[PDB]
């Protein structure tokens, strides 16, 4: 079966280099042209690089023309993307794709399309240091009430949030993170519950951020404004 | 370069109904020799890589359900879904590979499910007492389960409309009632937060007859 | 389905040789007859294979520059040929078939084999020397059937009166191209002075029958 | 013993130890014998058996003036190109069937026969070609395909590519890339009144 | 090429028990493997082909299995005509067909230590110019055994040949002989001649020795 396993992504300082890999199986690799396509966070698809089946044709997008170098090892069936002098605009998920034809730009009659894609490597260019998040409660206000947890100031992506260790799933919304001006990410995870259970059911969110070896459980309680 | 322009940027179609996505190219994409337009269509669901649907403008990729169909030629192209199924909610890209300026994609069309207008449930959350001990105040405004996606949130601090200190995040369309949820985070310093008393967010949405505003008073609880 | 090889051969080293193997009842003109070597006490080793109709060989890397395999589809016969024979080529040679069955391959009949003996010797009868019992409950004596050609020899003890405990070993081919064989027997040590032990060697090709008395050696 | 009562040697076509590459496909002419297509269709090992212009059931009841048996190898996803009115690298550049094709197409997965660990590169296919093949045309040319206006002078390189290319069949490949043996039967009906055939 | 290796070297199974034979390939062979049986003096006979399919005309007690690199032949309820040597041959179509070394199937029996005797060359053979020193290992089990010639405590190699009888039809034992061949001039240069026998039935290597002229 067709299979493209990518690797090499990660956090890189601006101006530093990073080599992306892409191992292929299930088809005669030395015979097909390979593409590299990235997708910046929240943006559309953008073409990056291209190599021919005999590692001859090499073409690049305007934004990466000299900084990126594409190569292939037809003996190890692997595609490489050597990304040098990285900039923030390069932060994206990078896919490698197989061409239907040998990616021979001049033949034209044999021009192919993106047949099979890989799962994509995450690449983040930033001068941020790895940090675990702080979890702050979004306390329910004094028929149904809303509560949640605030996951603020962590790096890099991603985090995983559950409620009552998975016992609470109905009405759970965990928002995609937002990148703050400081360079760290911020995220919120909420859930709607009946107002009659705010005094009887203990609600605890379970945030897990593997890059910092951090797992936090935070008890969200109603702001007791009565004494 | 060959510029690809899809129409529309987003559309909603109810299940079992027909969806149609157009895509126009700058220069013609037609090798007159074989008479094949070199245009491809892709489906991209959240978190996944793209999935090839159509190539040669009108040829279907092996395994794609027969409800997907591409047509058009030259500079005007069309991707049509006939019996829109729940799993077809995704972004669709046209992509030319005429071989001239390498390869260019389209901006991508967002395909959501159409339903009855639904009003948002609004809740506001004051900054917790644990965060203010750190020096930063984060005020959160929630728009839970609404349709359609278009919504306008307006923060007000002592009746002064706030902008430039707020970030929003929207969930993808829910898988069972096909609604949206939105989160806007108003960030302030502890000193600036302690200078004003009335904090509120003003939501405007189609499902609402007049702008809704939820509020709390600074240090009132 | 039926393959038939040629009869056993005997050649001097350096002489040319070609054995044959005719087939019948094949699925189609495009089969896969293959030659396999088997040395006296070795194992199986593949050599080559041909599709008669196409006559396309696939010699094994350890055999490529040594033997040539040919075929004539008119007689549906496969051939294995040596340009120059050496003593190392002395072995048994089988031909096996491998018909095609659309989805996969299927080996059917297996040749009975052709024995090849590369030696520069001739017909010679064996010398019979005693393996005397040691002076030190049961003792062991025997005979040595050395330097004879060709096979086989038959060894008996006391004209057939001593069969219990006799182990007549299969012969070995020395470097000299002649065969050597040993036959022993374990007897009670108390009978070494009261029971005479003689071994009857019979080698029909050389018209030789030798009886050799085995006694405890006199020091 | 050969007689014309003897049946036609379809075993030689289907039961060959090795097929030709699709760019240089083989063509056997079956003639001066009696053909029985009952054994062919009945076989439960044919993953593809499509006939054009003639139903396979009425094969033994038909009168042909001529019969062709073309045989080659392609990969699984390329089987659908062996039909009238198709395009693709195989139908345009390796083997093309006429629009009024009157015959049958028989295919079976041959992954136990034509794939080796490390890749069987014996099978080739023409990939580069200026104009499409005509129906039943065989191009065994090996001339370096010139893409640009700069001549190649027989040398491989940029804008100068070898027109042929190997499958490299490995047994671990997906069925869409595994080797499939194909046999294409071309018929030649007899112009005769219905009262005969 | 693709090296085929089997295990074990030899085995021992009583009638009715289940024989288990393995076969390993150096690289993958998909499933184009074949097991054979070669009874003494007979041509090989096919048992399993395609890793698992039983050849027509073969008892259903034999069975094959495996895929890729490791395979197995199982003989359920072993019989008395099942004593032979079993190989595994692969036949991938555009490749050199390779062969295993084989495995010998025997009668199960208790371990027995070999009887070691050393025979000096007779005075009638020394008059000819050649000395043949024979070392005997009488009725032992299992088949595996190691003989090491020692001439004046110099381990000898390259000047000896060995011969083994078949498993005896009454006690299931083997008999092995090793003939040290030397010239009369080389024989009269040394004094101590010995052969060292190591075996499973022997706790330590057993050595029988004679001195030239004694
Ligand atoms: C290509 O060759 C295969 C292989 O034939 C094999 O080799 C021969 C030398 C003989 O030894 C055959 O016994 C052996 O299988 C042909 O496959 C065989 O086809 C025949 C009919 O053509 C099948 O016979 C039938 O078997 C079924 C049960 O499977 C019965 O119900 C029928 O009554 C009839 O006996 C036979 O099964 C089949 N062999 C296998 C292993 O499937 C194949 O037909 C041939 N193809 C062509 C186009 O010639």
Residue numbers in the entry:
A (entry chain A): 1 to 142, 148 to 232
B (entry chain B): 1 to 221
C (entry chain H): 2 to 137, 142 to 224
D (entry chain G): 329 to 525
E (entry chain L): 1 to 214
Question: What does the report in the manuscript say about this coordinate set?
Answer:
Alpha-B.1.1.7, Beta-B.1.351, Gamma-P.1, and Delta-B.1.617.2 variants of SARS-CoV-2 express multiple mutations in the spike protein (S). The RBD mutations found in Alpha (N501Y), Beta (K417N, E484K, and N501Y), Gamma (K417T, E484K, and N501Y), and Delta (L452R and T478K) are located in or closely adjacent to the ACE2-interacting surface where they have the potential to modulate ACE2 interaction or disrupt the binding of neutralizing mAbs. To understand this, we generated 674 mAbs from Beta-infected individuals and performed a detailed structure-function analysis of the 27 most potent mAbs: one binding the spike N-terminal domain (NTD), the rest the receptor-binding domain (RBD). A detailed structure-function analysis comprising 22 X-ray and cryo-EM structures is presented for 16 Fabs most in complexes with RBD or S, which allows an understanding of the changes in antigenicity of the Beta S protein.
There are two IgVH3-30 mAbs, isolated from different donors, in the set of potent Beta RBD binders, the second being Beta-29. Serology and BLI mapping suggest that Beta-29 is similar to Beta-22, and the crystal structure of the Beta-29/Beta RBD complex confirmed essentially identical binding modes. Interestingly, these two mAbs also share IgVL4-1. In summary, specificity for Asn-417 seems to be achieved indirectly, with the residue nestled at the heart of the antibody-binding site between L2 and H3. Although there are no specific high-affinity interactions, placing the residue central to the paratope renders it sensitive to the change in electrostatic charge at 417 characteristic of the Alpha, Beta, and Gamma variants, but agnostic to the residue being an asparagine or threonine. The Beta-53/Beta S complex structure shows attachment to all three RBDs (2 up and one down), and higher resolution analysis of the Beta-53/Beta RBD complex confirms that the antibody attaches at an epitope overlapping that of antibody S309 identified earlier (Pinto et al., 2020). Like S309, Beta-53 makes a substantial interaction with the N-linked glycan at residue N343. Compared with S309, Beta-53 sits some 10 Å further up the RBD, toward the ACE2-binding site so that Beta-53 contacts the glycans via H1 and H3 instead of H3 and L2 in S309. The Fab approaches the ACE2 site and is likely to brush against the N53 ACE2 glycan; however, ELISA competition data confirm that there is no significant competition with ACE2. Both the HC and LC make substantial contacts (466 and 270 Å2, respectively).
